[PDB]
Structure 1
Amino acid sequence: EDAELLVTVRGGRLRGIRLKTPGGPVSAFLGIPFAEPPMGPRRFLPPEPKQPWSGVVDATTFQSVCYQYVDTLYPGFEGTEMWNPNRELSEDCLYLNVWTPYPRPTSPTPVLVWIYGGGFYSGASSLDVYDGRFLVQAERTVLVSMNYRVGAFGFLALPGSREAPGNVGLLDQRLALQWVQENVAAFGGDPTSVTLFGESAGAASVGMHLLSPPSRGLFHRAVLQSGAPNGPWATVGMGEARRRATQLAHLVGCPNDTELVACLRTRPAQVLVNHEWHVLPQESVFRFSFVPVVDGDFLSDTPEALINAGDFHGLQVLVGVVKDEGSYFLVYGAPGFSKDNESLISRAEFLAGVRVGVPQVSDLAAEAVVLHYTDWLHPEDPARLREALSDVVGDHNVVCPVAQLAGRLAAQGARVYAYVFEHRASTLSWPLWMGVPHGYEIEFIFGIPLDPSRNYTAEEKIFAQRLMRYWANFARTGDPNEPRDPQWPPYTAGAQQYVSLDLRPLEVRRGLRAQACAFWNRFLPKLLSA
């Protein structure tokens, strides 16, 4: 019997499992209950701490995936299936995972806590691409990841009501962070060195924990990959949250908030999922029905206002983007786009694309977008149009919100490091024109190329190892840099320096699309106001 796989946490005893890597074994504890199952009368409610159990919880395999839409755009395509549930769906899904060196550390080891993305409507901690074994073995941290409720189960809100208060998916994450504070030491982890990292809606979630005081005591550093709490998709106002909740009820045959939530609670989970997308105000890409709501509780103001007001002295943050943030999203409803052709679009398609990738803004606003992003010497060239619509979607949704966050944090006391991830994986199954798409730096950060059963090059493995070193350096010290040999300088509102991450050594550059982001961050708000 292996005593390295036996662990007692406050609620009871756990039996973990030993995992293999090309670098030696790792201890893993998968499927640890951290909340009471949020089912029946507990749907839409805040998570309750998991009650103590007797006997041994079997933590040798991943647990169920929180109920969510399953992507059917390209059935069986690698590039989409890698994000789909790889366990059975269930509302009984609040479990977290711990990987730790083997044998377990006997001195406090810094903790990395992963929060998955998926637009707040999808995702799981069990995806192959989130496999913690390579990071833990290589950089000897403790790694934790949790499932949190998504879609209406996590974010349906009738503001004011006790029955559906909103943001419970965010509370799921906070409970898991509390859990870590109370129990990570039993695994060799150091609760005083906890670094949050997340991608897309996971990065948005990380920033929201930054801006919400009751979370802020639960971690010490923060990594934001390709997402930001101020992104225009990441939050919704109270009024609009009430309208969307109300339309879901009508769509599934339900009628006073108490009566409304009660009837919603009688419906099978799959029925809510089936209808969730039909509550969005217009046709779009990059917009999601149930998201964090600004209501004074979890978020006392908008993430924007909160970022501007904050004193961020003492904070170290790592943030960045992939080279082509917008391309992936275009195949989900921009006229003329497909992964299976060159997507060489017409000016009229571009024009229609813009109202899809920049939803719910005025005509005048859309015109301003077309002005900035048209090359008026080549207004109708298909290739340039495809690239320009990709820039529109990427800039609006990811790059410029991340740029705004980095500038305001650095200017208000934080130490910020910025990257652009520019390496196209040799194994990438999306077409060439998509470039380096959204989400394809994750497999490198988690060191998936080290898996021999996969087909990365020798150079991609050396690359993964570099990235894993930067990230773990940052978690340990607040500074990704390796000792002087080329150095990764802090990002500042003035010099705006960041580094390129690819097979070549670090290259220092200026401006996260500064010209484009002045448009979105400086001009466009003035316009919508006045």
Structure 2
Amino acid sequence: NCRLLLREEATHIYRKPGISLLSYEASVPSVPISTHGRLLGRSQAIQVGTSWKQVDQFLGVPYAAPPLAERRFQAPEPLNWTGSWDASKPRASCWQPGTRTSTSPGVSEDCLYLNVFIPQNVAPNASVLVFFHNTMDREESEGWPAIDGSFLAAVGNLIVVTASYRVGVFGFLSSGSGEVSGNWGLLDQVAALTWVQTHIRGFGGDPRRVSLAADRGGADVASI
């Protein structure tokens, strides 16, 4: 339960209702991305304690061109799409080195994809968290793969974005003096950070409050 913070006592209290920049249409949220087009999403009802909140989640948004067999070991070109991307299912995370190689779409290449969770009525200039995490081989049939940051979003009234990035030999390979220089995963993290710097204001967030986060060896490649 949330109460209002006031400096002094008063006898008449009025508040303009909260607004959302997410145009609902038949209970799937949609957002216009400026250069490219539209995003079609998903809506979820989430219980904390005995209270329920609706969070609109957009799993699978891309931020760069896929590196398959030609853009491997190279800087990420932007992905220049047009139309209506279907952000309703999780995509694949990148090739972690220790992997049992179970037959699943959990890990593969083409893994430069976002996951954006926005509560129903956020603060008008809400903070943004950007969590970098490549999930392990888990069956994504139960949607959200191993990080549903939507709970932190719902409890903390803020926008959560969980990204993926190249790691391992695909993330970092260096050979010769030039053009296989390296830090490809770092450039992928920079590209994701520029994407959430540019396009997040249509979601309700504020791009001057972005907070970087990583963990467990990914923090070694985040403090750079």
Task: Within 5 Å, give how 1:447-526 maps onto structure 2.
Answer: none
1:151 aligns with 2:175: no
Distance 2:133 2:184 in 1: 16
* Structure 1 residue 4 displacement after superposition: 6.7
Q: 2:86 — aligned with what?
A: 58
Work out the CA distance in 2 between the residues paired with 1:190 and 1:178: 13
Which of the numbers 164, 183, 186 marks the counterpart of 2:202? 186
Give the conservation status (yes or no) of the 8 Å contact 1:11–1:50: no
- Aligned partner of 1:97 in structure 2 is 115
The DSSP-based 3-state class of the residue aligned with 2:60 is: strand
Q: Classify 1:141/1:25 alpha carbon distance in 2 versus 1 (closer, same or farther; 3 Å).
A: same
Higher relative contact order (CA 8 A, sep 6+): 2
Contact 1:33 1:94 in 2 (8 A): yes
Q: Which residue of 1 aligns with 2:36?
A: 11
- Write the distance in 1 (CA, Å) between the matches of 2:98 and 2:218: 18
Match of 2:59 among 4, 7, 30: 30
- Name the SS of the counterpart of 1:205 in structure 2: coil
CA distance in structure 1 between the aligned counterparts of 2:191 and 2:106, rounded to whole angstroms: 23
Q: Give the CA deviation at 1:66.
A: 1.5
2:37 partner letter: G
Matched to 1:38, the amino acid is P
In 1, Cα distance between the equivalents of 2:194 and 2:120?
Answer: 25
Q: Structure 1: which amino acid aligns with 2:89? A: T
SS class of match (2:146): helix
| SS of match in other structure, 2:110 | coil
Distance change in 2, residues 1:26/1:182 (3 Å) = same
Distance in 2 of aligned mates of 1:86 and 1:191: 35
1:21 alignment counterpart: 46
- 1:48 equivalent in alignment to 2:80: no
Aligned partner (choices 156, 180, 185) of residue 169 of structure 1: 185
Q: Secondary structure at the match of 1:204?
A: coil
CA distance in structure 2 between the aligned counterparts of 1:143 and 1:159, rounded to whole angstroms: 39
Alignment partners' CA distance in 1, 2:145 and 2:62: 20
What residue identity is the alignment partner of 2:158? T
Return the offset for 1:159.
Answer: 4.6
Task: List structure 1 segments (4+ residues) > 4 angstroms apart after TM superposition.
Answer: none
The CA RMSD over aligned residues, in Å, is 2.6
Task: Give the residue type in structure 2 aligned to 1:109.
Answer: A
Question: Which residue identity does 2:91 align to in structure 1?
Answer: Q
Once the two structures are TM-superposed, the CA of residue 140 in structure 1 deviates from its matched residue by: 0.9
Per-residue Cα deviation, 1:29-71 (whole angstroms, up to 9, x for no partner)? 11011101111211110111111x2321000111122223454
| Deviation by residue 1:122-167 (Cα, 9 ceiling, x = unmatched) | 789x7743111111111111001111111111111115231x2211
- Aligned AA for 1:65? S
Give distance in 1, aligned partners of 2:104 and 2:194. 27
Q: 1:113, 1:197 within 8 Å by CA — same for their partners in 2?
A: yes
What TM-score do you get using the length of structure 2 for normalisation?
0.76
- Secondary structure at 2:88 match in 1: coil
Change (3 A) 1:152 1:184: same
Query: Which residue of structure 1 aligns with residue 106 of structure 2?
Result: 88
SS of corresponding position for 2:155: helix
Structure (1 or 2) with the greater helix fraction: 1
Distance in structure 2 (CA, Å) of the matches to 1:85 and 1:8? 36
1:89 CA displacement: 2.9
Work out the CA distance in 2 between the residues paired with 1:38 and 1:112.
26
Equivalent position amino acid for 1:165 in 2: S
Structure 1 stretches lacking a partner, 5+ long: 76-83, 209-530
Mapped to 1, the partners of 2:109 and 2:220 lie a distance apart of: 23
Contact 2:104 2:137 in 1 (8 A): no
Residue pair 2:107, 2:137 contacting (<8 A) in 1 also: no
Q: Return 5+ residue gaps in structure 2 as ranges.
A: 1-24
Following superposition of structure 1 onto structure 2, how do residues 244-323 of structure 1 map, counting pairs within 5 Å?
none
* Structure with greater strand share of residues: 2
**Quick one: which amino acid aligns to residue 184 of structure 1?**
I
Seq. identity, %: 38
